[PDB]
């Protein structure tokens, strides 16, 4: 059980794992156009942290993009494959992700969530009440009136995992 950061570096190994992650994202988010998932996962501004089983099988992951000078990151997609859900991997992934964001000097995580995900993100400590001013994300994150933007503050000295 490894949680490795994967980026489009053009090797066959990382590419196969990024396609496997894209395939988990489309099968677990069927409302999402599959061509839109491909475009963000393989965009040079996005990175993906995968949950690697036996150092070769991707069973989950989180695709995100950092706004390094602004110190915030928006979570693109997050999913765990169906046959590996309710095994606590999703929480271990979010904790490993927040630990990496703390090391990347990222202060806030933002994500658009609607319906059930408002609840899953509230359990991972994301709130609908923002602490970060609206003008800090405007012009970097898209303002949709159709979703609920949730934010999680990453304090520099909180330990993330249990």
């Amino acid at each position: 059980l490894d949680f490795d950061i994967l980026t489009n570096d053009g090797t066959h190994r990382n590419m196969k794992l990024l396609i496997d992650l894209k395939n988990i994202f489309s099968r677990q988010l069927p409302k999402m156009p599959k061509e839109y998932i491909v475009k963000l996962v393989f965009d040079r501004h996005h990175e993906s942290m995968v949950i690697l089983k036996n150092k070769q099988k991707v069973i989950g992951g989180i695709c995100f993009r950092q706004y390094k000078p602004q110190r915030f990151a928006e979570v693109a997609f997050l999913a765990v494959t169906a046959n590996e859900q309710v095994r606590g991997y999703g929480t271990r992934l979010m904790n490993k992700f927040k630990d990496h964001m703390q090391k990347q000097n990222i202060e806030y995580l933002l994500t658009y969530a609607d319906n059930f995900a408002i609840g899953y993100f509230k359990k991972q400590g994301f709130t609908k009440e923002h602490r970060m001013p609206q003008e800090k994300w405007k012009g970097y994150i898209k303002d949709y009136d159709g979703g609920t933007l949730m934010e999680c503050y990453i304090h520099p000295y909180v330990d993330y995992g249990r």
Binding site: L29, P30, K31, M32, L40, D43, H45, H46, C63, F64, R65, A73, E74, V75, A76, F77, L78, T111, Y112, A113, D114, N115, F116, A117, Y120, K138, G139, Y140, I141, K142, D143, Y144, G147
Partner: peptide
Amino acid sequence: QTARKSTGGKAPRKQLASK
């Protein structure tokens, strides 16, 4: 906005699933 490169927003309908 009117990005066409930006970050990403999910597609969580509601977890009892089919689309």
